[PDB]
């Protein structure tokens, strides 16, 4: 809903709620950790 | 007279000269009301 910040476990909805970011930003956060319905398990 | 090498008035039933309802499939020019009379003598059989 009001989630929008660029800068201030794995599951993108959970990341997006907890850190107050979009799921698009959450997927970016997952990729940053790592360094469609594709697995992250 | 007006051009009739296209459009509805260019075509009519062979049997009875009807101005509507003509079956032009397989290029025989017969209206369905005529066709049901003659389909057996033309050769057609029914199964469905």
């Amino acid at each position: 809903k009001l989630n929008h910040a660029v800068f201030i476990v794995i599951t993108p909805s959970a990341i997006a709620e907890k850190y107050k970011v979009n799921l698009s930003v959450a997927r970016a956060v997952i990729n940053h950790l790592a360094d469609s319905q594709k697995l992250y398990t | 007279v007006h051009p009739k090498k296209y459009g509805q008035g260019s075509r009519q039933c062979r049997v009875c000269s009807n101005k509507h309802a003509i079956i032009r499939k397989y290029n025989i020019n017969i209206c369905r009301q005529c066709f049901r009379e003659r389909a057996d003598i033309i050769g057609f059989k029914k199964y469905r």
Partner: protein
Amino acid sequence: IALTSKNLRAIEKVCSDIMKGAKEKNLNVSGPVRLPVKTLRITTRKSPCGEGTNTWDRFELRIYKRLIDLYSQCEVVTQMTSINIDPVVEVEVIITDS
């Protein structure tokens, strides 16, 4: 030699006869190849004025094609086919090697 009819029985009968005829003059034949059936299919509303129920029936005029072919000179096959025929079967001859 290609055999066409819209008469099922007549094409079937002629085929057996021409094969029998072929062995009489001892010709080298390939066994009769029945070619895919061609149907003139007409889907017709039963009501003549189109009033009442939407009743449709499907009429079929089914034409039969068959092929039997021969390694022979032209003269024997043409003479044998020409004598043996029945009127509703339409026949065409196809030329072959010596």
